[PDB]
DNA sequence: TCTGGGGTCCTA
DNA sequence: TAGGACCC
């Protein structure tokens, strides 16, 4: 009768996992990131607890910046293995409900629920909250709509430890005067381009002439922005396993690199680590991309397609160093990265 | 106490 | 192939 999309998102996920092994820190500023040493430059916070966010600290903020704003915080090192496991357990529980479940991120998933005319999608959401709490001790919030984009927007209102329903009835009323980058899939660049067209809010964008948007953004993107402004989005929740298109590793060096020999051997290392992981996953490499960023934060990526797909390490390393070779080391290097694109056609 | 790391996909 | 743009 009525299809609902429920977006379930774990609250302050990494901090919550940390709070499981350190319950005395509940209600205190806890900042996860780096090796838990707040003075290291070139590292960021990966999760701030809600109490640390009152001091302005947020994921993405450098650790040194977070130490300046919240001197009393307990800084904890990032524990990805713990976070990976705590996510695996949460999602396994979420599928156990029997609904389509689509996992996005370590801390989120969408769940499809066709419900009729009783009952209430909120009670599904309440049971989801009660289940994950009693089995995992972790708190989630749940945004409810009929499509993924709108449900995800609804979750931002549901936080923390809550539930929120956002549909055609209350879309525009809720969303109308908000800036266009509150829409999932619109960010600061599209926002500035819209502001140069006289469009500063979701309501403005939802009534904008399609041709103005398709001329400026593309015949498909212009229409999509209109759809998203009117509250629409992807409605189907797929339970099929995700098959990654690429795998990559980048590294920002604690001190800018001046020696070619160090650059080659970092590229070689990144290539060989990434290749070893994708081979573990039974994948084959199609393209090799190498990223260079300079001390002035100037970032370019070059990519080369291999003659045929392969997992040959000598071929992949040489590919990576040839692609690196087309750059200039005119300036010192802040970061190098390798990304390996992967064959999709088979598993 | 400048500016992380992991990804996807439109379009030129 | 480049790279702009957005997301978690
Ligand atoms: N730039 C970023 C942005 C996000 N992340 C990571 O992805 C998770 C996204 O959270 P989520 O934004 O979907 C919210 P979360 O931070 O758990 O707290 P909330 O529940 O109150 O929103 C973050 O906590 C970060 O670890 C990152 O590594 N780099
Ligand atoms: Mn979260
Ligand atoms: Mn999330």
UniProtKB/TrEMBL annotation:
Active site: 108
Location relative to the cell: Cytoplasm
Record's keyword annotation contains Nucleotidyltransferase: yes
Keywords: Cytoplasm, DNA damage, DNA repair, DNA replication, DNA-binding, DNA-directed DNA polymerase, Magnesium, Metal-binding, Mutator protein, Nucleotidyltransferase, Transferase
Enzyme class, UniProt record, top EC level: transferase
GO cellular component: cytosol
SUPFAM superfamilies: DNA/RNA polymerases (SSF56672), Lesion bypass DNA polymerase (Y-family), little finger domain (SSF100879)
Chain residues that bind Mg(2+) 2: 9, 107-108
GO BP, sorted A to Z: DNA repair; DNA-templated DNA replication; error-prone translesion synthesis; SOS response
Enzymatic reactions: DNA(n) + a 2'-deoxyribonucleoside 5'-triphosphate = DNA(n+1) + diphosphate
GO molecular-function term, one example from the UniProt record: magnesium ion binding
Site feature: Substrate discrimination: 14
EC number: 2.7.7.7
Pfam family, one: IMS_C
Record-listed Mg(2+) 1 binding positions: 9-10, 107
Cofactor note: Binds 2 magnesium ions per subunit.
Cofactors: Mg(2+)
Quaternary structure, from the entry: Monomer.
HAMAP family given in the database record: DNApol_IV
PANTHER family, per database record: DNA POLYMERASE KAPPA, DNA REPAIR POLYMERASE UMUC / TRANSFERASE FAMILY MEMBER
Protein name: DNA polymerase IV
